[PDB]
Chain A
Amino acid sequence: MIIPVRCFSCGKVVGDKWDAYLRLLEEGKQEGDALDELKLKRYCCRRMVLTHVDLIEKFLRYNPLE
């Protein structure tokens, strides 16, 4: 839905890295290199960001009803 604040397994804060990750993917860096640069070293933290599906973009498309 929206990026989780913490890593499930260990609890590192990954919620402040989604925008940097998107900008890194924009400038051509492949996913492993982007995750390396954000200093996500444990594969739990890495799969937190690598497997996220951002559905809030899809939910926001339905007009506010008030």
Chain B
Amino acid sequence: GVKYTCGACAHNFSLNKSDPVRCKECGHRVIYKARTKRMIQFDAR
């Protein structure tokens, strides 16, 4: 679905709204979403 990342072991994964909020590799408590896929433009000013 949507990509996440661990806060402790930097593991990338994806959860589907029914698992608890947790990391797979270590089991850490806080996770961060991944950067979007769209392309972002800046004015360089």
| A contacts, CB < 8 Å to B | 64-66
Contact = CB atoms under 8 A, between A and B. Distances in A.
Interface of B: 5, 7, 10, 12, 32
A15 to B, nearest CB: 15
In order of increasing CB-CB distance, the 5 nearest A-B pairs are A66-B10, A65-B10, A66-B5, A65-B5, A65-B32
8 contacts: A64-B10, A65-B5, A65-B7, A65-B10, A65-B32, A66-B5, A66-B10, A66-B12
A66 B34 CA distance: 10
Contacts of B7: 65
A64 B32 CA distance: 13
Contacts of B10: 64-66
Contacts of B12: 66
A65 B32 CA distance: 10
A4 to B, nearest CB: 15
Nearest to A66: B10
